[PDB]
């Protein structure tokens, strides 16, 4: 079932997160830096595709991190190793 939907997302290309909650999330972060910030519709969608593929690569690496430790599930330990070994977090 979980691998049944693997085919759907790996065969069809689509956005996998809600549109406006992402827009609300980036707005609330931007408002702290500068209030009354104006966001273009293309700009917020462009960041979404980069953000989605950023986690897809992270979720791809964490999958191989689990199989390294004789594991299938990915845990908070897996995400710590991937970010640090890549220089993103440390």
């Amino acid at each position: 079932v979980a691998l049944r939907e693997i085919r759907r997302y790996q065969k069809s290309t689509e956005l996998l997160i809600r549109k406006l909650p992402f827009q609300r999330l980036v707005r609330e972060i931007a408002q702290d830096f500068k209030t009354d910030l104006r966001f273009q519709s293309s700009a917020v969608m462009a960041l979404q595709e980069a953000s989605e593929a950023y986690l897809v690569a992270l979720f791809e690496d964490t999958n191989l991190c689990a199989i390294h430790a004789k594991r299938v599930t990915i845990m908070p330990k897996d995400i710590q190793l991937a970010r640090r070994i890549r220089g993103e977090r440390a």
């Binding site: 979980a2 691998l3 939907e5 693997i6 997302y9 790996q10 996998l16 997160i17 809600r18 406006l20 909650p21 992402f22 609300r24 999330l25 980036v26 707005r27 609330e28 972060i29 931007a30 408002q31 830096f33 500068k34 209030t35 009354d36 910030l37 104006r38 966001f39 273009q40 293309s42 700009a43 969608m45 462009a46 960041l47 595709e49 980069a50 953000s51 989605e52 593929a53 950023y54 986690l55 897809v56 690569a57 992270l58 979720f59 791809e60 964490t62 999958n63 689990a66 299938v72 599930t73 990915i74 845990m75 908070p76 897996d78 995400i79 970010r83 977090r89």
Partner: protein, 99 residues
């Protein structure tokens, strides 16, 4: 009329709502879909907060680059051109949305 940072009309012709904890917009179906696109069968429950936290770290860094790029030209609107310039510096580059 006139307007500075914005919201010059006031009165009853404008409305804004407080956004404080909208990070939770990335919910369980949304988080698992990106995990599914990564090809993982099972994802733990504790990484849902971590994935949202990772996204916040990822978004806060790219926003700084985009805002600074936009503030250089003093333009109120953040165009798609400034985003891809920010993306180039951080390594995570997206083709499209301007060229």
């Amino acid at each position: 009329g006139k307007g500075g940072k914005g919201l010059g009309k006031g009165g009853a012709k404008r409305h804004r709502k407080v956004l404080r904890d909208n990070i939770q917009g990335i919910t369980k179906p949304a988080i698992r879909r990106l995990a599914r696109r990564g090809g993982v069968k099972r994802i733990s429950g504790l990484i849902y907060e971590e994935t949202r936290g990772v996204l916040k770290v990822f978004l806060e860094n790219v926003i700084r680059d985009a805002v600074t790029y936009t503030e250089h030209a003093k333009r109120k609107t953040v165009t798609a051109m400034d985003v891809v310039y920010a993306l180039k510096r951080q390594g995570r580059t997206l083709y499209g949305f301007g060229g």
